[PDB]
Description:
The first copy, chain A, is α/β, with parallel strands linked by helices and 254 residues long. Chain A has a single domain (1-254), classed as 3-Layer(aba) Sandwich (Rossmann fold), CATH 3.40.50. Chain A is built from eight helices and seven strands, in the order βαβαβαβααβαβααβ. A seven-stranded parallel β-sheet of chain A has the order 3-2-1-4-5-6-7, with helices on both faces. The termini of chain A are far apart. The A-D interface holds A 68, 103-107, 109, 112-113, 116-117, 120-121, 124-125, 127-128, 131, 148, 150-151, 153, 156, 159-164, 166-168, 170-176, 241 and D 69, 104-108, 110, 113-114, 117-118, 121-122, 125-126, 128-129, 132, 149, 151-152, 154, 157, 160-165, 167-169, 171-177, 242. One NADP nicotinamide-adenine-dinucleotide phosphate is lined by residues 11-13, 17-19, 37-39, 42, 64-66, 91-94, 118, 143, 145, 188, 190-191, 193-196 of chain B.
Amino acid sequence: NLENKTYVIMGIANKRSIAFGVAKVLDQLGAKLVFTYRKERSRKELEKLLEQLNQPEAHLYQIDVQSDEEVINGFEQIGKDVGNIDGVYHSIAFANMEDLRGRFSETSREGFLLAQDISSYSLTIVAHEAKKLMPEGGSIVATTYLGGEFAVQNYNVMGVAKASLEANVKYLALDLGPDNIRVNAISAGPIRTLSAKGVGGFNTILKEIEERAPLKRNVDQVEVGKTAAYLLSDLSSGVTGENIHVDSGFHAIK
Amino acid sequence: NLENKTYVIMGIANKRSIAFGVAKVLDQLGAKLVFTYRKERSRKELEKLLEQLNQPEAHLYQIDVQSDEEVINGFEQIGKDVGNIDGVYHSIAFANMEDLRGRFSETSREGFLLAQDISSYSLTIVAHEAKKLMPEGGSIVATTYLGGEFAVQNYNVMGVAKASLEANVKYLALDLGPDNIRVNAISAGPIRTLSAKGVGGFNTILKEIEERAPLKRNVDQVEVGKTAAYLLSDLSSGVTGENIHVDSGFHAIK
Amino acid sequence: VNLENKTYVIMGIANKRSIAFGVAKVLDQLGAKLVFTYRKERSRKELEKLLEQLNQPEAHLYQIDVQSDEEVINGFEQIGKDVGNIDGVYHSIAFANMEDLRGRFSETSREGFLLAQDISSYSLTIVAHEAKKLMPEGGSIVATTYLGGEFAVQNYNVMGVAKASLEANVKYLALDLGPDNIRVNAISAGPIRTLSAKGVGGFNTILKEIEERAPLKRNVDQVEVGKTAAYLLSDLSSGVTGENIHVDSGFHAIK
Amino acid sequence: VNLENKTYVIMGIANKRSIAFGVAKVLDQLGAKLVFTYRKERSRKELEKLLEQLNQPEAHLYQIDVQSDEEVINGFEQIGKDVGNIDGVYHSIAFANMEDLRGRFSETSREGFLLAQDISSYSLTIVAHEAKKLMPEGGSIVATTYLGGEFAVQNYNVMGVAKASLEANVKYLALDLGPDNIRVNAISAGPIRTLSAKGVGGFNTILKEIEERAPLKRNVDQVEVGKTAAYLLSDLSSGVTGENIHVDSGFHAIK
Ligand SMILES: NC(=O)c1ccc[n+]([C@@H]2O[C@H](COP(=O)([O-])OP(=O)(O)OC[C@H]3O[C@@H](n4cnc5c(N)ncnc54)[C@H](OP(=O)(O)O)[C@@H]3O)[C@@H](O)[C@H]2O)c1
Ligand SMILES: NC(=O)c1ccc[n+]([C@@H]2O[C@H](COP(=O)([O-])OP(=O)(O)OC[C@H]3O[C@@H](n4cnc5c(N)ncnc54)[C@H](OP(=O)(O)O)[C@@H]3O)[C@@H](O)[C@H]2O)c1
Ligand SMILES: NC(=O)c1ccc[n+]([C@@H]2O[C@H](COP(=O)([O-])OP(=O)(O)OC[C@H]3O[C@@H](n4cnc5c(N)ncnc54)[C@H](OP(=O)(O)O)[C@@H]3O)[C@@H](O)[C@H]2O)c1
Ligand SMILES: NC(=O)c1ccc[n+]([C@@H]2O[C@H](COP(=O)([O-])OP(=O)(O)OC[C@H]3O[C@@H](n4cnc5c(N)ncnc54)[C@H](OP(=O)(O)O)[C@@H]3O)[C@@H](O)[C@H]2O)c1
Ligand SMILES: Oc1cc(Cl)ccc1Oc1ccc(Cl)cc1Cl
Ligand SMILES: Oc1cc(Cl)ccc1Oc1ccc(Cl)cc1Cl
Ligand SMILES: Oc1cc(Cl)ccc1Oc1ccc(Cl)cc1Cl
Ligand SMILES: Oc1cc(Cl)ccc1Oc1ccc(Cl)cc1Cl
Ligand SMILES: N[C@@H](CCC(=O)O)C(=O)O
Ligand SMILES: N[C@@H](CCC(=O)O)C(=O)O
Ligand SMILES: N[C@@H](CCC(=O)O)C(=O)O
């Protein structure tokens, strides 16, 4: 039960976003939620999607995590509007398709660095600013993919960005542990989202999970959301620096 | 919320057992619980301990996991007394004391095979017998230790038994996944228990966590029990073949 | 790499396809003196034939069934008397019963699970304890494992749990014996057609998966395992212990 | 091994304590022709002097700042015209600001994080791309990493995240270049006293902890890394790619 808790959820674009799965679970459990977005179009979808939740009010903030000033001023404004928070769900990544759909060895410098910036460094800075609203401690979750742990076909520059993200969770866990702030990752199996359309071969990845993964089915956004609830709540006290695979067991087989 | 769930908890020795932590938590959450014990000092005991739970009956079964008959007939009888169950917590391990200190290279064949038998194979047979009481699926959790993933001083033969136990979980996840049975582990940090006494140099292990783990503190039986409630329930539906460290982040640092 | 004036015990040659025969060819070619141990007289007869291919001036052949403490103990002690001190051991030994290597893992019998642990894991422990007696200036023990020890692979079943156990055994041995200057390491070999692979269900589809999906897009062979064994058993790998090197065309690194 | 008529590019020698210099000595002793790349004009001066300890009859020194594509592109092209085709590249390059290193990880600057990614991880990718043009029959590329890429190590901070990225870069390149018969691997070296180690807070307690706790109970040295490099760069390691070999006295394997 999450009444009297407040979570910031970053990275909803539409109803298929993984962070909307998180939102529904946390809302169902009585949490107060605050949302962040980059594009106008995403604020618009948030304004619509809120009509399905129980949030008595829209708490929406534009934060493009490429900008320090936006991350810093964003969280400062959230603190002024709703007070201290209990956690952050981070559901944000980006890379160019021009890099993704080429050979990994042909990745450009600007594109490799773009992916690191949005997909990994953004957690470091978000945690830094979020820490200020968690003086009694709290919980931070980021979303990763098994391509951070192994070389998967076509995932390419994003796989290197996710490896970087998973180490970021571990170094943040260590840094922020004494402040009673836990930092963890969920490694989600493939789910049809707007961003999935950038991963070449995506339907093939879905089919391989059904045919090979222990549970012989794909996961969805609500399943990622239920494990987020566990990680953002006191149910997972003691658990930090961990990568929980919500992927029908695919990580465990070869 | 676990009202109308039933869980078999194996491995309570006394008020300090990790499995009793698990029991208080599932009991608080409204589960019907069933308990197995090895021998008749644990029983007398057990009976007294359960006045602290809201269990309105005492369902207790002797099962020494070294005997097929006892496991086969114990789950059979459980099945007859309470019907289908929703999951199994396995909290059971053993090795000879001489082996948990001094030199791993001097371990006896008998001592090595005894630790494998009780600490690893017992999950395979308990799984096979429990599956019979879970026609619509369910959840199996075992308790391991970092010494199954890394060589740790003194833990010696039990570390090889936990390596084996951790694979056991993965192979059972693969096998039982189509039957909708999830199989996972919780890698607990060190906890002062009756069995901890037999681990060479336990007190130093304890202190190392406080000094070096991200949370700078040790965990307890109830923090294990909370992650057990997660893994035993539908919050973790997308999760199988997994090992969750409830160890203050220790597993993530070096 | 030159291994003249080194001496290596190789355990688990059955025939010309054995992984340990790849190791033997490579070590022998590098000038090492080799001692071979076998379980069945048929393997000894095979060893006698296979030696005529190697440069070894003599046959050092010992029957050691690793289920027997006395055979391991008396075998290594006899080896010490015939050749003196050794430089390392290549361990290439596993077993489980047929029925535990296809279909369903949850149905594994206690007897079959413990058999597999006994031969495929505990053997390395007692071998190392006895071999250590012949390595007073230090040396190098290598065991052979498979990717099924790290992940659940279809059909591998009880052997996978045996390999997990082997891989932790290597780590505990490494820690225990490091101060004696004995390194202990594993080679995680890719799938290779051998007599014992006839026991793994779906083995042909395993090979074919490697060709299609592994970074090098081809299978490995026994000599490539023997080349990494030469590195591990020699002074090139000083510093390296508790380590599991995958000779498998990259397959462990991909999903 | 046996590396005559092989040619390797070694990137990242600054002085006699550099890890890459340990690679150079081992490879040079094994008969390789070596080509050296540097950033600072002062590192070139050290090379010219370190080269008298070596059997290289010719000094092949090239300035390449891996921050600049132009420099990596023109550098390898020039190498190709001066020495023809090469057999492999040893990459020993990393960098991050002190000011980011010696602050709390959570206080890392965006610009210092991207700097460490750019020099210590991206550089392998572009190096691999340009070096492929000089390896039409295949070859081997080895990068240097540290345990702090796999676990959160006190003080290593932004470099830990750059090494994690570098270890993944290795696996993705292994996959991409495998069909070209180019293997790409990492060595995970234990702590070694070098100029760059001065940047790591608590470096001397890291050394002491290896001596007290690692299976071998001693630290490793640059030559030990060089010897595993010789294996990885040569045909002994055929079949090995996407791999991370810990040259660290076993420390990776214990907790
Ligand atoms: N779908 C899957 O199979 C899968 C599997 C595993 C992991 N993941 C991870 O899950 C996370 C969420 O992605 P998703 O699949 O749910 O796709 P999604 O719905 O497309 O969400 C991606 C989100 O990232 C945000 N974003 C990108 N760049 C940003 C920036 N500079 N500043 C702020 N926000 C930015 C986008 O916001 P705007 O649209 O406003 O630009 C969008 O809300 C990602 O980290 C992804 O890598 C996805
Ligand atoms: N405490 C820790 O720091 C630690 C850390 C990580 C993991 N673990 C794991 O947690 C689990 C529980 O241990 P614990 O620390 O809670 O110790 P514990 O209270 O002493 O529990 C051990 C239990 O195992 C039971 N058992 C032993 N052999 C058995 C057999 N042959 N058949 C049936 N039951 C048998 C014992 O029963 P009897 O008393 O009747 O003999 C006892 O109830 C173990 O698997 C252990 O390795 C412990
Ligand atoms: N082939 C592969 O794809 C592959 C892949 C990865 C790992 N491996 C591993 O490589 C190792 C060698 O197997 P292989 O494929 O080369 O098969 P192999 O030629 O059939 O060799 C197996 C050896 O194990 C010996 N053995 C079995 N039980 C023994 C016992 N109790 N005492 C002494 N020796 C015993 C056999 O000797 P006898 O015939 O005399 O009984 C035989 O020489 C094993 O650990 C295997 O698991 C194989
Ligand atoms: N020392 C250890 O304990 C340890 C342990 C594990 C891994 N490693 C790794 O080993 C590698 C070598 O470091 P080291 O310890 O040998 O220290 P080092 O002697 O200080 O070598 C570092 C080299 O990096 C080069 N470099 C930095 N930025 C560069 C750039 N932009 N372009 C081209 N070259 C650049 C330096 O060149 P200039 O001097 O010309 O600037 C220097 O030659 C690094 O990847 C390091 O992370 C070191
Ligand atoms: O990480 C992902 C993994 C998968 Cl299988 C599918 C979608 C993913 O998400 C992304 C993939 C590429 C880009 Cl450019 C951005 C995002 Cl959010
Ligand atoms: O696994 C354990 C790990 C730790 Cl740190 C402490 C206690 C543990 O539990 C055991 C240890 C030894 C034996 Cl013989 C039996 C059990 Cl239950
Ligand atoms: O470990 C192995 C892995 C593979 Cl892919 C192929 C063969 C293997 O070797 C064995 C397999 C089963 C048994 Cl009963 C004995 C051995 Cl020696
Ligand atoms: O990676 C390393 C690890 C260790 Cl233990 C010691 C030195 C290392 O090398 C570096 C450390 C910091 C910077 Cl700024 C640059 C380099 Cl080359
Ligand atoms: N059809 C795209 C794949 C993208 C997807 O399936 O989302 C390709 O393979 O080029
Ligand atoms: N054809 C049988 C034999 C096994 C094998 O070829 O290894 C199977 O695949 O089950
Ligand atoms: N003097 C540094 C240590 C630097 C080093 O040990 O290289 C400190 O702040 O600990």
